[PDB]
């Protein structure tokens, strides 16, 4: 597993430790997507929402997927590739989740759905990349997404993440 895989897992854990010491809301006020236009130049906020989790089990479940799928991208395609998927999906999954239902959300699962979509489509159109997603796991992923349509899931983060990963894998598959 590479530097970007590990750095992100450490970050999410450090931030979650702060959320236990200080309480959820205190961290949310400083890390959530800007709830007020005046705050709009607090640039960290467009990415920082990805680092917050509200359960130990929601953070165990996300770092697992992230280490599996993120580690695969870093190993096969490099650190720079994983940084870009991370940054774009975090920004765009946040943007869409905000419009669906406002700024009070968090979790890496937007980034995870982009990794699910990227690894799958890249492995299908471009097998020589040496990444792929089992059809079994694309099972999981699809049940998980539709289940949020009906636990208060950030539904716009999930679809926007997924879409982002598909588009990037599509573009990268042309080019490969």
């Amino acid at each position: 597993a590479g530097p970007v895989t590990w750095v992100m897992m450490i970050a999410c854990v450090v931030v979650f430790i702060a959320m236990q010491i200080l309480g959820d809301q205190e961290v949310m006020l400083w890390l959530a997507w800007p709830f007020d236009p005046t705050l709009k130049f607090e640039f960290w906020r467009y990415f920082t929402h990805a680092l917050m989790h509200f359960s130990l089990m929601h953070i165990l479940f996300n770092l697992l997927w992230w280490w599996y799928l993120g580690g695969a991208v870093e190993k096969r395609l490099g650190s720079g590739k994983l940084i870009v998927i991370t940054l774009i999906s975090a920004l765009l999954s946040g943007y869409v989740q905000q419009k669906f239902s406002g700024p009070w959300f968090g979790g890496l699962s937007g980034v995870v759905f982009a990794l699910m979509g990227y690894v799958w489509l890249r492995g299908e159109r471009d097998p020589q990349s040496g990444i792929y997603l089992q059809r079994g796991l694309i099972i999981f992923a699809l049940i998980w997404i539709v289940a949020g349509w009906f636990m208060s899931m950030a539904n716009g983060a999930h679809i926007a993440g997924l879409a982002v990963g598909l588009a990037m894998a599509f573009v990268d598959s042309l080019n490969a």
Partner: peptide, 5 residues
């Protein structure tokens, strides 16, 4: 509420 991504 808060939503979970």
């Amino acid at each position: 509420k808060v939503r979970m991504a």
